[PDB]
Structure formats: structure tokens, C-alpha cells
Design a protein around this ligand. Structure first.
Ligand SMILES: Nc1ncnc2c1ncn2[C@@H]1O[C@H](COP(=O)(O)OP(=O)(O)OP(=O)(O)O)[C@@H](O)[C@H]1O
Ligand SMILES: [Mg+2]
Ligand SMILES: [Zn+2]
Lengths: 624, 49
């Protein structure tokens, strides 16, 4: 037949038209012509180059564009819309033959090529679907709410004859109903027959639940949902919580026995998938020499310190601390008998309305391994380890808190002052020993909790009391406070000039939202490379200065009658110097980095003190 | 102040132990120099060799 001949159907329906041998041969030949005769604007072989990159990675799936097939040959597009199931087998055999025609012996490295249609005009919401859409090609949006594991499905099945012990050859599984045999060719029997698990070849299977995105739902109504089945290379692509675009076929579950089941005869529906798309920190040798180049510009430190929370006004000290705790340091083991941690903890104590949660939000978008938990609220993760039951699989699971789940990363605790006793015990253990212990339901174990803590809290009453020390404004205890390196105090001092700029910035935000800076994308990757390969050094020519600095700050602290100074302050000094040095991708901690570090600790100590002590110290420590 | 009221618990708990070690952080420049030097060498790498 010819192409304009096919567009006069001479059968009861499309399905019976497509299955006739003469029309199948025609469409197979015309698909070969489409594969090997396309040309872009310039004329490049759009599918030729795709079929040669098929060879290199050796993939088993091919991408086709509906726009091109509508451009060339329209009856094929109509049949693809109406009866895709029959079309896709024919189209997949054509692709496999064409690939072999350009890569010989690829039928061994892979035995079947899958076609996935990329673009398609009509896009539906889950609530619009009706019974006129059954057995048709559809494209939908939604959000992924649940996910199952990977189960194997039968592809090439071998049977045993339990009288003459023979293995009957490959039989194909259609993904509709289970296949059963009835005749043994060697002994001529219809006896018992069982599937040979060892000689069978299987396929990947997974199921997902799609929900209407909350934003689009018209007022007053509720979101609808549907189920999606993914086969082979599509398993484990979209993790729960993301928005996806699905191209597939709309089908009925042939439930079971329609007998019994008294009541109206209703049926259930599913979607069988063809393509999924979404609607990183790995780097390359192109960007490595750009890293090194930016590292040679004097003053990379102040660029980084102004590339942090790029939408909160002022608060330079907290941004410096954020950078320090977002780069890190070097963990240490002295001959397997002494450990000094590497991460630097940061506490925020501030009055209501100073944008602490905004910085905590930024840290989570900027970091690799960051987790969020709340003290007094509703969060998807707690702080205590436990053994609970899985609602879906009905299994017992071991779950750790955010502290365990955020190993070698950062943990973000919001509303740090409203914890119950259990959460406080967990936090203390994690910060002190850096490992979580559990003895529940026969499980005795210790887990690793090498994590960085950033926390936010509100004083007692609601406002800061400058006439008393830090320990008497907040409900936390000295054991916990002493385990933090840097303490930041945000004070709502009524100053006339500052309000001008604060209100200006805030009003500009609303006005603009009506219906130095390094780019964030490069900073994200620079942070990972630096923390992966940069372990700066401490050559001891520079020991004389710090000995005498510590001596002076110890002699002054006891004289003034305030907090004691212990060696944890010097350890913090060195650990922060490591971070300032690592900022410059450096090779030997400089004295400039040490001097920059000294300010942070001295300022923290001076600013966390009573008014009288603070006036004494702010004059005594003027040189550092 | 007596050691008894220097602890936030009952004083009969002390009779349970065998050795009671009270460590006092006394300020003195010469000790400070030595301890600071000790810490700074451990962070250098000297104590590892
Ligand atoms: N310095 C600031 N610069 C910019 N925006 C600010 C600043 N301080 C507060 N805001 C804004 O004011 C609001 C404060 O809300 P937010 O929850 O962040 O404050 P908070 O101190 O974390 O809250 P609370 O302590 O009362 O729980 C936000 O819109 C925040 O962006
Ligand atoms: Mg808040
Ligand atoms: Zn037989």
C-alpha cells in the first residue's frame, strides 16, 4: 500500500486496521524511511548522531520527537495518538534493526531498544480525565507522593515438564496477563508445568502515586490522584516530593471477578509510563582552572562573606560565621588515641523579627548534606533515634534522627529553646561524643554523628537583658552553650538611621515582587571541591604570637571577673584559622588568616558579657 | 565555701566513692606558656612523631 492509502480505514476500528499484516509492513517500511531520511534546519542527521551516541554509552532507549513525526507523516501521528500500544512494538523493532545497520553485534550488548516520545501537544490535569480517554496517549503533570521498591517482572520465561524433565524455550510476556503453556513437544503431555526461575530473564518494575499540585487546584475542591507504572530504565528517577511530566497510556485495571461484588459495576484506572522529565555539585576540568584563578585574587574572603544570604540586610558577623561553618576545617587523630573535631558550631540568639529563619533557609539551599528539624512544630524528621513500623510495607525499620541522617554535613534546629528532655539528651550526646547510641527491640548499636550544628533561639521574656550575662537570658545550660564555638547575639536596638535602610529594603522587596557577588552556582561547587581536596597545614614558625595572645587574654579575664577562658578558645582559634586558610585553597596557614580568626573569638567573648565588664574589655582588647 | 555546698546534689553521695579528685583552674603565666606550647605542637604534627 502507500501512505495516502492508509488514511482510508476499511475496518471496524483503528486497532483491527493496524493489526492486518499488509498495513503493518507498510508502516514498518515508512518508519525505516523516517529514521534514515531526516534533516534539521542546517540538515544535520538528528537521529543519526543520536544513534551513534547510542553506541558509546550503549544505552537501550531512544528519544523521538512528536513534532517531527507530525511534520513528516501525519497518519502515523494520528495512529500514535489513538492506538499507541500496537504502534510502539512496530516502532521498537524498526529502531533495533536501524541500530544494527550502523553498529554490528549490538544485539548482544543489548537485546531491545525502547522508544520514548518526547513532546506531545495536549496536557491534562488529573481531574479532567474521563472514560473517553481510555486506551489513549496522554500527558499529565503532578507531584510524586509515594514510591515503591524495584521488583522483577517476567520477560523471557522457561517452563519445566515434570514428567520428562525438559526446559521449554523462551516465551514472551506482554505486560497484560500471565502466560501459561499446555503441550510438551518431546513427551506429548498437558501435565503439570512450572517456571524455571534460574533460566528466566526479568524486567524492572516500580509504582508511583501522582497528586495534583496544590497550587493549581480551583478554590473549594480537593486534589485528585492517580497511579503510574514504570518499566526498565525509568525506575528510580523521581524521588518523592518533586514535580514531573508523564507521557503514557490510560488503562483499566481488569480488577477481578465482576461476579459477586454487589453494587454498581465500576472500574479502576492506571497510567503506564513512557517518559518522565523534571519541570548539581560535580565539577569538571573546565571549571577547575577557573577555581584556581578566582583563588589568586587577594580578598576572596570578603567576596565569599557577601555572597552568603544574598537577601537579608546587614548582619556581617553572622554571615562571616556562616561562611566559616559552611567551609569547615580538618579533623585530627593523634595515633588513634586522641580526636579533635573539625566542624565549627554556630548559635544564634536574637529578638523576634531579625531574620534568623531566613539564614537557616539559605544554608539548606546552598549546602550538599543539610537537614532541617524543628523543636516546637511539625517537621518531617525528629531528633531521636527509634524503631517504628513502615505503613506501606508493614516492616520494622531502624531510623536515626536528623543528627544521624546529616553525617558530614550540617544540622539546622529551629526554635532551639523549646526542646523537651528527650531532644535535649540527644543533642547533648551528639555534640559531646559525636555518636548516637540506641538499645531498643533487640538492637544495640552506636551510629556516627559527625555533623555541624546551627541553631536559633529567643531569650526569656522576649527581649534581651543587657544587664545580666548570657547564661541568665536564655534557658539553655552552660554544658550545652560551652559546646558552641561562635555565639551571635542579635539585639533590636532602636536606632533612627538604621531603620531608614531596613524599611527601604523591605518595601523595595514588595514593590518589586508585585504581579563582589560570586554567582551562587559556582560557589556551590567551589564549596565542594575545597572541602574535598583542601587540607591546609599548620607549620609552627607561627607559634610565638598565639602563645602570648592566649596568655594576655587569660590574665585579663580573671582580673575583670567574668567568664573563664579555657583552651577551648584557643582550639577554636586554630580551627577557624584552618577555615580562613582553606578559603584561599592555600598550602600553609598564613598569619593573616590567624589575625582574621582572632577577631571572631575575641568579639564573641566581649559581646556576650555584662555592660560594665563589656566596657572594661572593649578598651583592654583594643589591639586585637 | 565548703565542698558540700559546691555540688548540686545530696552530700551522702560522696561517701560512695573511693578517690575524690578536685581540679582547680589556677591562673599562672608560666603554666599557661607550657600548656599553650603543648597544644600548638599537637596541632602542628610533632606529637604524632
Ligand atoms: N535584617 C533583616 N533584613 C531583612 N529582612 C528582615 C530582617 N529582619 C527581619 N526581616 C524580615 O522580617 C520577617 C521576620 O520573620 P522571621 O521568621 O525570619 O524572623 P525570626 O526572627 O526568625 O522570627 P521569630 O524569632 O519571631 O520566631 C521576614 O520577612 C524577614 O525576611
Ligand atoms: Mg523563626
Ligand atoms: Zn514432557
Amino acid at each position: 500500500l502507500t501512505l495516502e492509502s492508509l488514511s482510508n480505514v476499511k475496518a471496524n476500528s483503528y486497532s483491527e486496521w493496524i493489526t492486518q499484516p499488509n498495513v503493518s509492513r507498510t508502516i514498518a517500511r515508512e518508519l525505516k524511511s523516517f529514521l534514515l531520511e531526516y534533516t534539521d534546519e542546517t540538515g544535520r542527521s538528528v537521529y543519526g548522531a543520536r544513534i551513534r551516541t547510542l553506541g558509546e554509552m550503549n544505552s537501550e532507549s531512544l528519544e523521538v520527537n512528536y513534532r517531527h513525526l507530525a511534520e513528516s507523516k501525519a497518519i502515523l501521528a494520528l495512529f500514535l495518538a489513538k492506538c499507541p500500544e500496537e504502534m510502539l512494538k512496530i516502532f521498537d523493532l524498526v529502531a533495533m534493526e536501524a541500530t544494527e545497520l550502523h553498529y554490528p553485534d549490538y544485539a548482544r550488548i543489548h537485546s531491545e531498544i525502547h522508544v520514548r516520545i518526547s513532546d506531545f501537544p495536549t496536557i491534562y490535569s488529573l481531574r479532567e480525565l474521563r472514560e473517553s480517554n481510555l486506551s489513549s496517549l496522554v500527558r499529565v503533570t503532578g507531584v510524586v507522593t509515594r514510591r515503591t521498591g524495584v521488583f522483577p517482572q517476567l520477560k523471557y520465561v522457561k517452563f519445566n515438564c515434570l514428567k520428562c524433565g525438559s526446559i521449554l524455550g523462551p516465551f514472551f510476556q506482554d505486560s497484560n496477563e500471565e502466560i501459561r503453556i499446555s503441550f510438551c513437544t518431546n513427551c506429548k503431555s498437558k501435565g503439570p508445568f512450572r517456571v524455571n526461575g534460574e533460566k528466566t530473564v526479568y524486567r524492572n518494575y516500580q509504582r508511583v502515586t501522582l497528586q495534583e499540585a496544590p497550587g493549581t487546584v480551583p478554590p473549594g475542591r480537593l486534589p485528585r490522584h492517580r497511579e503510574v507504572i514504570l518499566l526498565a530504565d525509568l525506575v528510580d528517577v523521581s524521588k518523592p516530593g518533586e514535580e514531573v511530566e508523564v507521557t503514557g497510556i490510560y488503562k483499566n485495571n481488569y480488577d477481578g471477578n465482576l461476579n459477586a461484588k454487589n453494587g454498581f459495576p465500576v472500574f479502576a484506572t492506571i497510567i503506564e509510563a513512557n517518559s518522565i522529565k523534571r519541570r548539581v555539585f560535580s565539577w569538571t576540568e573546565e571549571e577547575e582552572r577557573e577555581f584556581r584563578k578566582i583563588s589568586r585574587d587577594r580578598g576572596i574572603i570578603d567576596k565569599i562573606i557577601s555572597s552568603m544570604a544574598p537577601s537579608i540586610y546587614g548582619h556581617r558577623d553572622i554571615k562571616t560565621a556562616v561562611a566559616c561553618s559552611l567551609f569547615g576545617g580538618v579533623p585530627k587523630n593523634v595515633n588513634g588515641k586522641h580526636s579533635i573535631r573539625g566542624d565549627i558550631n554556630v548559635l544564634l540568639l536574637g529578638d523576634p523579627g531579625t531574620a534568623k529563619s531566613q539564614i537557616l533557609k539559605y544554608v539548606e539551599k546552598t549546602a550538599h548534606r543539610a537537614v532541617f528539624a524543628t523543636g516546637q512544630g511539625a517537621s518531617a524528621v525528629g531528633l531521636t533515634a527509634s524503631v517504628r513500623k513502615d505503613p506501606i510495607t508493614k516492616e520494622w525499620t531502624l531510623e536515626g534522627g536528623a543528627l544521624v541522617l546529616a553525617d558530614k554535613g550540617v544540622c539546622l534546629i529551629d526554635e532551639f529553646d523549646k526542646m523537651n528532655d528527650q531532644d535535649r539528651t540527644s543533642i547533648h550526646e551528639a555534640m559531646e561524643q559525636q555518636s548516637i547510641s540506641i538499645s531498643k527491640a533487640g538492637i544495640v548499636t552506636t551510629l556516627q554523628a559527625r555533623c555541624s550544628i546551627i541553631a536559633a533561639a529567643n531569650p526569656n521574656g522576649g527581649r534581651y537583658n543587657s544587664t545580666l550575662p548570657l547564661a541568665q537570658n536564655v534557658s539553655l545550660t552552660e554544658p550545652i552553650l560551652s559546646r558552641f564555638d561562635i555565639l551571635c547575639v542579635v539585639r533590636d536596638l532602636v536606632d533612627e538611621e538604621a531603620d531608614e535602610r531596613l524599611a527601604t529594603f523591605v518595601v523595595d522587596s514588595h514593590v518589586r515582587s508585585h504581579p563582589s557577588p560570586i554567582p551562587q552556582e559556582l560557589l556551590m561547587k567551589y564549596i565542594h571541591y575545597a572541602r574535598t581536596k583542601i587540607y591546609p597545614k599548620l607549620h609552627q614558625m607561627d607559634m610565638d604570637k598565639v602563645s602570648r595572645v592566649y596568655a594576655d587574654l587569660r590574665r585579663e579575664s580573671i582580673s575583670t571577673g567574668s567568664f573563664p577562658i579555657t583552651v577551648r578558645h584557643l582550639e577554636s582559634i586554630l580551627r577557624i584559622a584552618e577555615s580562613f586558610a582553606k578559603m584561599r585553597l592555600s598550602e600553609f596557614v598564613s598569619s593573616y588568616d590567624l589575625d582574621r580568626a582572632i577577631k571572631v573569638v575575641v568579639d564573641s567573648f566581649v559581646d556576650a558579657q555584662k555592660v560594665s565588664v563589656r566596657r572594661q574589655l572593649r578598651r583592654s582588647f583594643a589591639i586585637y | 565555701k565548703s565542698p558540700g555546698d559546691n555540688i548540686d546534689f545530696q552530700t551522702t553521695i560522696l561517701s560512695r566513692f573511693d578517690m575524690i579528685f578536685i581540679v582547680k583552674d589556677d591562673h599562672n603565666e608560666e603554666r599557661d606558656i607550657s600548656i599553650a606550647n603543648h597544644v600548638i605542637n599537637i596541632h602542628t604534627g610533632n606529637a604524632n612523631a
